[PDB]
Design an enzyme around this catalytic site. Sequence first.
Site, PDB file in Angstrom:
ATOM      1  CB  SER A 109     108.668 -72.940  68.401  1.00 50.47           C
ATOM      2  OG  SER A 109     109.807 -73.197  69.204  1.00 50.47           O
ATOM      3  CG  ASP A 225     108.871 -78.814  74.062  1.00 48.63           C
ATOM      4  OD1 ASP A 225     110.094 -78.719  73.862  1.00 48.63           O
ATOM      5  OD2 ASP A 225     108.032 -78.043  73.528  1.00 48.63           O
ATOM      6  CG  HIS A 255     109.620 -77.893  70.334  1.00 48.57           C
ATOM      7  ND1 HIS A 255     109.012 -77.069  71.258  1.00 48.57           N
ATOM      8  CD2 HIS A 255     110.067 -77.085  69.343  1.00 48.57           C
ATOM      9  CE1 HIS A 255     109.085 -75.816  70.836  1.00 48.57           C
ATOM     10  NE2 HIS A 255     109.728 -75.796  69.680  1.00 48.57           N
TER      11      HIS A 255
HETATM   12  C1  LIG Z   1     118.494 -65.493  74.459  1.00 46.71           C
HETATM   13  O1  LIG Z   1     118.951 -66.439  73.497  1.00 46.71           O
HETATM   14  C2  LIG Z   1     118.518 -67.731  73.629  1.00 46.71           C
HETATM   15  C3  LIG Z   1     117.632 -68.040  74.647  1.00 46.71           C
HETATM   16  C4  LIG Z   1     117.181 -69.336  74.802  1.00 46.71           C
HETATM   17  C5  LIG Z   1     117.626 -70.349  73.960  1.00 46.71           C
HETATM   18  N1  LIG Z   1     117.088 -71.636  74.155  1.00 46.71           N
HETATM   19  C6  LIG Z   1     116.321 -72.435  73.342  1.00 46.71           C
HETATM   20  C7  LIG Z   1     115.666 -71.917  72.237  1.00 46.71           C
HETATM   21  C8  LIG Z   1     114.919 -72.797  71.477  1.00 46.71           C
HETATM   22  N2  LIG Z   1     114.172 -72.363  70.358  1.00 46.71           N
HETATM   23  C9  LIG Z   1     113.520 -73.134  69.473  1.00 46.71           C
HETATM   24  C10 LIG Z   1     112.892 -72.283  68.587  1.00 46.71           C
HETATM   25  C11 LIG Z   1     112.061 -72.569  67.395  1.00 46.71           C
HETATM   26  O2  LIG Z   1     111.386 -71.653  66.923  1.00 46.71           O
HETATM   27  N3  LIG Z   1     112.024 -73.799  66.841  1.00 46.71           N
HETATM   28  C12 LIG Z   1     112.913 -74.941  67.092  1.00 46.71           C
HETATM   29  C13 LIG Z   1     112.030 -76.117  66.732  1.00 46.71           C
HETATM   30  C14 LIG Z   1     111.310 -75.598  65.497  1.00 46.71           C
HETATM   31  O3  LIG Z   1     112.216 -75.579  64.402  1.00 46.71           O
HETATM   32  C15 LIG Z   1     110.965 -74.168  65.896  1.00 46.71           C
HETATM   33  C16 LIG Z   1     113.232 -71.005  69.034  1.00 46.71           C
HETATM   34  N4  LIG Z   1     113.991 -71.033  70.111  1.00 46.71           N
HETATM   35  N5  LIG Z   1     114.806 -74.097  71.774  1.00 46.71           N
HETATM   36  C17 LIG Z   1     115.482 -74.494  72.851  1.00 46.71           C
HETATM   37  N6  LIG Z   1     116.235 -73.735  73.645  1.00 46.71           N
HETATM   38  C18 LIG Z   1     118.460 -70.015  72.900  1.00 46.71           C
HETATM   39  C19 LIG Z   1     118.930 -68.721  72.751  1.00 46.71           C
END
Ligand SMILES: COc1ccc(Nc2cc(-n3cc(C(=O)N4CC[C@H](O)C4)cn3)ncn2)cc1
Length: 278
Positions: A109, A225, A255
């Site tokens: 991720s 995911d 995910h």
């Molecule tokens: C520019 O700012 C942004 C842009 C996009 C987003 N959108 C997102 C981001 C994530 N993320 C999940 C992880 C992660 O490392 N994980 C979670 C699951 C596990 O714990 C590891 C990192 N980002 N998941 C879904 N939508 C948010 C802010």
Amino acid sequence: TTTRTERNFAGIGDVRIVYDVWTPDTAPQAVVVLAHGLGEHARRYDHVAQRLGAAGLVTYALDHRGHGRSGGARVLVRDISEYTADFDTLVGIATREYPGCKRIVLGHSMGGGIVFAYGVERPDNYDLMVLSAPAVAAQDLVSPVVAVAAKLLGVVVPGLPVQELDFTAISRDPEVVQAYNTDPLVHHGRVPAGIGRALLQVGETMPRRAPALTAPLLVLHGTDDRLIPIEGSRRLVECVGSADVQLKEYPGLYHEVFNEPERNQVLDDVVAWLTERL
Ligand SMILES: COc1ccc(Nc2cc(-n3cc(C(=O)N4CC[C@H](O)C4)cn3)ncn2)cc1
Ligand SMILES: [Cl-]
């Protein structure tokens, strides 16, 4: 048969970075350096390190700054280079301790984004790369409003919340979701501007930089995911320079493929792929 030893080093800014070393009781065949994702920590990877150790691999896994047992303001970062610099220190530690071993860099991720960014910056410092649902197209995941907020605010107020996440989307096993929600070392807040900016740094340059990644690459992604769409991994494997690149798509998985009910199948695939290529 794989024992864990906890150590620390001084990261960028003199932040205390805690990391685990997992050593099997067999002659080591290669070293794995593992980067976890946003809001978690390396102790969510015990079973991954144990399965890798059963194949004779030594795993180094850090808690990134602002995560888990490491120091630093929680989930605070201003630039992707903070994460990649500490990852680089860990790779160097593994290198000096197992100099006869090939080096595998593995990220999940956000950690897959860190590993990708490291891999295009130091493409001759590792031998194989494995990515689990890598966050390499974050720009396609937020509205333009969130992307502007993160880019403009991520250096000045890196802790400002910019986006909520659906924690129930990490796994379709409720036991995994429950364990995440009740983990005191895990972040239960929103995505902050600074990490937002760092993810955009990776995602906006991925097509231009991925040609420099020529090492063999394995990408794992669950088709269901809902946090990082699998379309981003399909795009990644089209942009890398490596001739030996594979995307293994797992139908119906969420995910965290390494934590899904089918995780032992996923890890069998990883071990098979690694063993062919060392
Ligand atoms: C520019 O700012 C942004 C842009 C996009 C987003 N959108 C997102 C981001 C994530 N993320 C999940 C992880 C992660 O490392 N994980 C979670 C699951 C596990 O714990 C590891 C990192 N980002 N998941 C879904 N939508 C948010 C802010
Ligand atoms: Cl928050």
